[PDB]
Design an enzyme around this catalytic site. Structure first.
Site, short mmCIF file in Angstrom:
data_model
loop_
_atom_site.label_atom_id
_atom_site.label_comp_id
_atom_site.label_asym_id
_atom_site.label_seq_id
_atom_site.Cartn_x
_atom_site.Cartn_y
_atom_site.Cartn_z
N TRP A 1 -18.03 4.92 -10.76
CA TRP A 1 -19.18 4.30 -11.38
C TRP A 1 -18.66 3.46 -12.53
O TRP A 1 -17.91 3.95 -13.35
CB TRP A 1 -20.08 5.42 -11.88
CG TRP A 1 -21.37 5.02 -12.48
CD1 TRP A 1 -22.30 4.17 -11.95
CD2 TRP A 1 -21.92 5.53 -13.69
NE1 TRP A 1 -23.40 4.10 -12.80
CE2 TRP A 1 -23.18 4.94 -13.86
CE3 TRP A 1 -21.45 6.44 -14.65
CZ2 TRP A 1 -24.00 5.22 -14.97
CZ3 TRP A 1 -22.26 6.71 -15.76
CH2 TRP A 1 -23.51 6.10 -15.91
N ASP B 1 -18.22 15.43 -13.50
CA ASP B 1 -19.44 14.63 -13.57
C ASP B 1 -20.25 15.00 -12.33
O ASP B 1 -19.82 14.76 -11.20
CB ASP B 1 -19.06 13.14 -13.58
CG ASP B 1 -20.27 12.22 -13.65
OD1 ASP B 1 -21.37 12.67 -13.31
OD2 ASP B 1 -20.11 11.05 -14.02
N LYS C 1 -31.28 12.13 -10.06
CA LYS C 1 -31.55 11.83 -8.66
C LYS C 1 -32.18 13.06 -8.04
O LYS C 1 -33.10 12.99 -7.25
C1 LIG Z 1 -21.12 9.00 -11.14
C2 LIG Z 1 -22.31 9.04 -12.05
N1 LIG Z 1 -22.18 9.50 -13.31
C3 LIG Z 1 -23.21 9.56 -14.18
C4 LIG Z 1 -24.51 9.17 -13.88
C5 LIG Z 1 -25.53 9.30 -15.00
O1 LIG Z 1 -26.80 9.81 -14.60
P1 LIG Z 1 -28.10 9.54 -15.51
O2 LIG Z 1 -27.57 9.02 -16.83
O3 LIG Z 1 -28.92 8.53 -14.75
O4 LIG Z 1 -28.75 10.89 -15.62
C6 LIG Z 1 -24.80 8.63 -12.51
C7 LIG Z 1 -26.16 8.16 -12.02
N2 LIG Z 1 -26.63 6.96 -12.72
C8 LIG Z 1 -26.74 5.80 -11.83
C9 LIG Z 1 -27.90 5.02 -11.88
S1 LIG Z 1 -27.61 3.78 -10.69
C10 LIG Z 1 -26.03 4.33 -10.22
C11 LIG Z 1 -25.31 3.55 -9.17
O5 LIG Z 1 -24.09 3.72 -9.01
O6 LIG Z 1 -25.94 2.74 -8.47
C12 LIG Z 1 -25.69 5.47 -10.95
C13 LIG Z 1 -23.64 8.57 -11.57
O7 LIG Z 1 -23.80 8.11 -10.31
#
Ligand SMILES: Cc1ncc(COP(=O)(O)O)c(CNc2csc(C(=O)O)c2)c1O
Ligand SMILES: Cc1ncc(COP(=O)(O)O)c(CNc2csc(C(=O)O)c2)c1O
EC number: 2.6.1.1
Lengths: 396, 396
Positions: free
Chosen positions: B130, B211, B246
């Site tokens: 990510w 994570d 999610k």
């Molecule tokens: C690997 C990883 N680490 C942290 C997060 C953080 O989740 P939130 O901050 O949304 O709770 C996420 C999810 N956040 C996210 C929103 S769109 C996205 C994507 O890759 O499209 C990812 C994640 O996939």
């Protein structure tokens, strides 16, 4: 990795809170609380908020992420509150607002934005201030320096000392101003004093950072923004960190705003792109529920009217307690001037008691304030006033 | 102060999003979305969540601030999800959990905690990951280094390359592991591979940072935590940043957790005091609404059962789309092996398309993915599958 970590300094809020909890005595009284309390000693959910939350429950069809800067309506309503409807600042598209997790979140976003994107190294804060200011700015790598504020002899703004202190501030330093209801003193600049400060800030090249956590708690929504608006009239650039925690009773929903102002739309948009980057690397995007409640209320004539009256009721109850406190201290034989309490603004004032008198109040009478002698006037009620004042008189 | 600020790199998410919005064509398809979508292309509020929110509306009597670490029930339920009921880790009181604003907030709290209180200077992240990981750790002053992960030839975990890369990691470096549903690849270590990595991490003195944003989206809640639990069995210390965005469909309410684990209760409590200090200087205390929904659901047998089935339904729909995608590509004459898609876990996979094929898909066919060729399988539906696959076949 963790075996040698030094514990954080003990939490004085938890506190306080824990010692108050553990106290066996009647009729113990908590003036060390941070929140508003009504005449029954409760911090209820505002009726306007409950109505808004019902609407959201009925109408929300997704929890899909907000943009990095949050709900657009929230930003617009925030700017109107801060600057006034029809402000040139707004018309000229000189301001951008990010919805943030509380006023604290807004301060940290401002701090990170400044540390990463500008030459700012130092923030000037009043002595005294909310103790978390230092923590927030230091966390972003910014030094904190103090300016004189409180005249401990007269319970007033030591304006000469303030100006003298701030002469040591260099061009390009940030100066933090509490918009209204200075925390902990309740002592705010007069409009004329704000205008003098606004002129001085332009001359000295300070970047003003307004912290607005109590809009509506001093005199009224518009009146309480006079100081900010005096600065806004004079400056190309400023930042406002605001909070809806106390004026909507939305403490735990984490509802605030970081508003960036620059000379023009091109410049603010460009700078704001980096503020959004700062947010993205912190909590990604802000929590919807509280901010949606605020936007729902502010943008609906009916709900806004209910909320405005609820805020007025809080403002007025605090004023009645300031008056009742002063009268009751006189009637319990304090025999000292406490009139300064009537003039001070918001939930907080210094009582003028020493740290040892405050400790005595806690230990011998079960009356709880913070060490500086700050008291939350909203912890006072018609029912607890007489014992409270008898205890204070006893430690004088 | 702001006149010379450089704009942040253009937002590729907004994107993407804006270009998709502006596209006049039928039947355009968005596989670049970050969220789950159902068979109708919607991201609805889960029924379990709506029920919980109704309960909260009915029962909440205050919005008074949560503690710095948030709702205690939330922390307990989180630890049970992560480590298993009756985990020695839990019994021995070796873990402390802060409720945070999302997984991103949990990662930033971990980063700030590590930067300020330990000798950590560097975090190892998979290539690819990510994109926000780098931003978050760099924001806290931590360097980010990449380790090999994706075998671009075989669409598999290049385990040898991973181990080889991580040999350059020094004792006291942090290594970031995606708990399950690796983003962007959907390629997760097998249990045996997790066990090998756990042993290696102990030997090399790495601090594991898990994570966990997709628990429940690969095989099931318990199965998806096997990797973490293998590490937890072997290590005195680790950190877990988890997210409920999610698996509860609570994206915009910002619901996650930072869980700190140390050798014993004294050590974790002492370290956690500094994690709380890190939170206090950031957003003060976390947003209640989303986390309260999670705690309400997880701690109630009836609501938990409804939620678990809703999560199962999402997991299963994603699996059905992976299968339908592979079958439909074959039936549209792709004539290439896409079987790897069936084996991958969660919403995301690399399609194996190049950046230019992805651009072609967008421009000529109005099918939208990210540049790396990552696609969100949950943007696929029985209705859009045939046109989607015809477009892909056309760019092969
Ligand atoms: C690997 C990883 N680490 C942290 C997060 C953080 O989740 P939130 O901050 O949304 O709770 C996420 C999810 N956040 C996210 C929103 S769109 C996205 C994507 O890759 O499209 C990812 C994640 O996939
Ligand atoms: C001067 C000042 N700046 C910022 C804030 C931040 O507000 P929230 O983060 O709660 O929205 C606040 C309010 N936060 C707060 C909670 S208890 C408290 C106190 O002084 O007792 C203060 C404030 O008084």
């Amino acid at each position: 990795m963790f075996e040698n970590i030094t514990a954080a300094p003990a939490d004085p809020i938890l506190g306080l809170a824990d010692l108050f909890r553990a106290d066996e005595r009647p009729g113990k009284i908590n003036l060390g609380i941070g929140v508003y309390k009504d005449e029954t000693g409760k911090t209820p959910v505002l009726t306007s908020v409950k109505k808004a939350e019902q609407y959201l429950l009925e109408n929300e069809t997704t929890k899909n992420y907000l943009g990095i800067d949050g709900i657009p309506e929230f930003g617009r309503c925030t700017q109107e509150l801060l600057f006034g409807k029809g402000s040139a600042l707004i018309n000229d598209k000189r301001a951008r607002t990010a919805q943030t997790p509380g006023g604290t979140g807004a301060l940290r976003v401002a701090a990170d934005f400044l540390a990463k994107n500008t030459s700012v190294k130092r923030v000037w804060v009043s002595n005294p201030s909310w103790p978390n200011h230092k923590s927030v700015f230091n966390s972003a790598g910014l030094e904190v320096r103090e300016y004189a504020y409180y005249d401990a002899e007269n319970h007033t703004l030591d304006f000469d000392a303030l100006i003298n202190s701030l002469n040591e501030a260099q061009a390009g330093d940030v100066v933090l101003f509490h918009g209204c209801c200075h925390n902990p003193t309740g002592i705010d600049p007069t409009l004329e004093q704000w205008q003098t400060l606004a002129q001085l800030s332009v001359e000295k090249g300070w970047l003003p950072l307004f912290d607005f956590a109590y809009q509506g708690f001093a005199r009224g929504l518009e009146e309480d923004a006079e100081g900010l608006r005096a600065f806004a009239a004079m400056h190309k650039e400023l930042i406002v960190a605001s909070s809806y925690s106390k004026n909507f009773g939305l403490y735990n929903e984490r509802v605030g705003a970081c508003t960036l102002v620059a000379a023009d739309s091109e410049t603010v948009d460009r700078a704001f792109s980096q503020m959004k980057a700062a947010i993205r690397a912190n909590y990604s995007n802000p929590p919807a529920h509280g901010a949606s409640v605020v936007a729902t209320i502010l943008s609906n004539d009916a709900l806004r009217a209910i909320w405005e009256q609820e805020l007025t009721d809080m403002r007025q109850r605090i004023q009645r307690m300031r008056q009742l406190f002063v009268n009751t201290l006189q009637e319990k034989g304090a025999n000292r001037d406490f009139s300064f309490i009537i003039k001070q603004n918001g939930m907080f004032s210094f009582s003028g008691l020493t740290k040892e008198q405050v400790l005595r109040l806690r230990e011998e009478f079960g009356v709880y304030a913070v060490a500086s002698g700050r008291v939350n006037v909203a912890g006072m009620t018609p029912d607890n006033m007489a014992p409270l004042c008898e205890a204070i008189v006893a430690v004088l």
